[PDB]
Design a binder for this molecule. Structure first.
Ligand code: CA
Ligand code: CA
Ligand code: CL
Ligand code: CL
Ligand code: CL
Ligand code: CL
Ligand code: CL
Ligand code: CL
Ligand code: CL
Ligand code: CL
Ligand code: CL
Ligand code: CL
Lengths: 349, 351
């Protein structure tokens, strides 16, 4: 049952959706909860992770904060060769003070780069940005790529209730295409405009609301035509595609109906079907979904080259999940793509 | 290869379509009244402002077919080889109506209208009752009236009622009644309530494309996590659109449900007697309305059991002869295909 690094089983295990935190940013969340400027999602999510005495919450916070020996030990213990790291949701996106947001993002990016310099064979970085300032975010995308060795950026879904399909956010996509790097749209809690019915049932987080928020965000980017404007752009999402691959037949059928009937101002003709974009511009990881039928379904729909392994450490750190993935009824060749070579291609490792 | 889609079961199965819609003119007129007077919620403005007033080819044909409960509907069924249709008043029914007497009156008339049509075409039309969850005790009486007097086989509730969900204790009499008559509840989509709709509406995603699945999947999930099936172990809830993504999310649902329960994170997420997977296998039933897509059907048959997945057309919102032809030609055993088109529905609706 021992899980080992080194690839002796035929592939490296590259985990592509792995989280860290900085104490000063967590402290901002606590400040916002204390002063009443935190949104309902931040109260729910970070009220829990930063303050709950539960074993799950306390271990997640300890592990999030570590970018050294302890993290490496946890990777070694589960045979994870490399982890692609990003500042944990929601990043600096909810912060009202632009100067504070840019300062703390800069610090989090420098901290991550330092950690990758210490463990260059184990840690790979994705930058964090502050979409409330799109041109600054463009500057930081360039700095991450040029100076910090990062492989792309992670945006934690909406920024203060606004979505990346607005023309306002264009400089972010412009810069991503300039540096030729992927965008990972990671979940966040829904904004206050949407969260209420999920919050009241305890469904606002990873169990449901994360998938709603993130699937909605990817879908609206597809339907605004982001991939016609930027045909080279790759967007990555976790959690087996936030249900979009399973909804695909219905997405394309209803999208076509809406386009033809002129029902909506922001749903005009696209050069490809939604299926077409999934095959050429969208990439999926299995974070949180260590489940062979769903993985195989997604591989069939999108292509086995477009589906990657992710652990979602430390929110879902489970050695038996790694064992289950190693044991799937897949060819050695498919397994190697899923664990290793797809990530090497798409993140340009 | 034939373009022929014939009634009569010569393929080896009847085609029983399990999520089919009709409208009444007087109820559509109430939606228009609410839109005009500003009492319609954003979902109604979006959905019914579209279907009742759009000049689009798609909307105009939909409205005509919805209103027919006779020879045209039968001809449309005959032309696509549909033997039987299970009919329900189209979403959101009378659920958004603030006047309780008007809601009960209009639901009663819609139920009586549907029952008359089923009596006229008894080998073709099967009815599901509509109710007014704003009044759960009246709704319970109407579930009984539909079962005993009108020959209905269950009820369809169009997800939320004025922003409230069925997991509230207030709605319990509806569940007591369903268990008493031993009939299934079909939770059909509706637009999200005003508390949730805004970001989807802006992007044109509030309807069938996405918001329907968000609203309905959320509603089913919150009923499972409140423990509805521990309270009422016999209760069957049906949903369409391949389970509103829940079967695909199952591993994540169970993992994060356990994490929530164990960490005592939320008041309304307490221990359940079965896993979410367990409830899908014993208490939830799925149709493929709007999802004429073999990989998704087969996935759902694997997760839930092939006995628990039924064919539905979603007429007239999705009336596509080519979809019936695709379903007929799936790489599925004759036995499984017959369960999917016919015998599962015969069992679960007690046809
Ligand atoms: Ca994550
Ligand atoms: Ca329907
Ligand atoms: Cl600077
Ligand atoms: Cl815009
Ligand atoms: Cl969560
Ligand atoms: Cl088209
Ligand atoms: Cl295409
Ligand atoms: Cl008849
Ligand atoms: Cl309650
Ligand atoms: Cl719709
Ligand atoms: Cl019971
Ligand atoms: Cl715990």
């Amino acid at each position: 049952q021992d899980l080992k690094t080194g690839g002796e089983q035929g592939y490296l295990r590259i985990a592509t959706e792995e989280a860290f935190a900085t104490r000063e940013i967590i402290d901002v969340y606590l400040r916002m909860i204390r002063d009443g400027t935190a949104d309902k999602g931040m109260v729910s999510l970070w009220g829990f992770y930063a303050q709950s005495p539960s074993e799950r919450a306390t271990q997640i916070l300890e592990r999030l904060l570590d970018l050294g020996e302890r993290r490496i030990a946890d990777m070694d213990a589960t045979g994870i060769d490399k982890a692609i790291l990003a500042l944990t949701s929601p990043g600096v996106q909810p912060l009202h003070d632009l100067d504070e947001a840019r300062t703390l993002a800069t610090r989090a990016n420098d901290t991550l780069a330092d950690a990758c310099q210490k463990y260059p064979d184990r840690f790979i970085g994705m930058g964090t940005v502050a979409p409330q300032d799109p041109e600054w975010s463009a500057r930081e995308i360039h700095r991450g790529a040029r100076e910090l060795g990062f492989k792309g950026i992670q945006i934690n879904s909406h920024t203060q209730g606004r979505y990346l399909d607005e023309e306002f956010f264009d400089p972010i996509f412009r810069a991503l295409v300039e540096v030729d790097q992927p965008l990972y749209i990671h979940p966040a809690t829904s904004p206050d405009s949407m969260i209420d019915p999920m919050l009241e049932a305890g469904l606002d987080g990873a169990i449901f609301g994360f998938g709603v928020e993130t699937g909605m965000h990817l879908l609206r980017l597809i339907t605004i035509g982001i991939f016609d404007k930027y045909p080279s752009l790759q967007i990555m999402v976790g959690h087996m595609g936030e249900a979009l691959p399973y909804w695909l037949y219905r997405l394309d059928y209803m999208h076509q109906a809406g386009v033809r009937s002129q029902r909506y101002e922001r749903m005009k003709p696209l050069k490809k079907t939604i299926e077409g974009y999934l095959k050429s511009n969208v990439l999926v990881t299995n974070s949180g979904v260590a489940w062979e039928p769903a993985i195989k379904f997604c591989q069939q729909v999108m292509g086995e080259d477009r589906v990657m392994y992710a652990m979602d450490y430390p929110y879902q750190y489970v050695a038996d999940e790694v064992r289950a993935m190693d044991a799937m009824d897949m060819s050695a060749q498919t397994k190697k793509k899923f664990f290793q070579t797809n990530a090497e291609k798409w993140f340009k490792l």
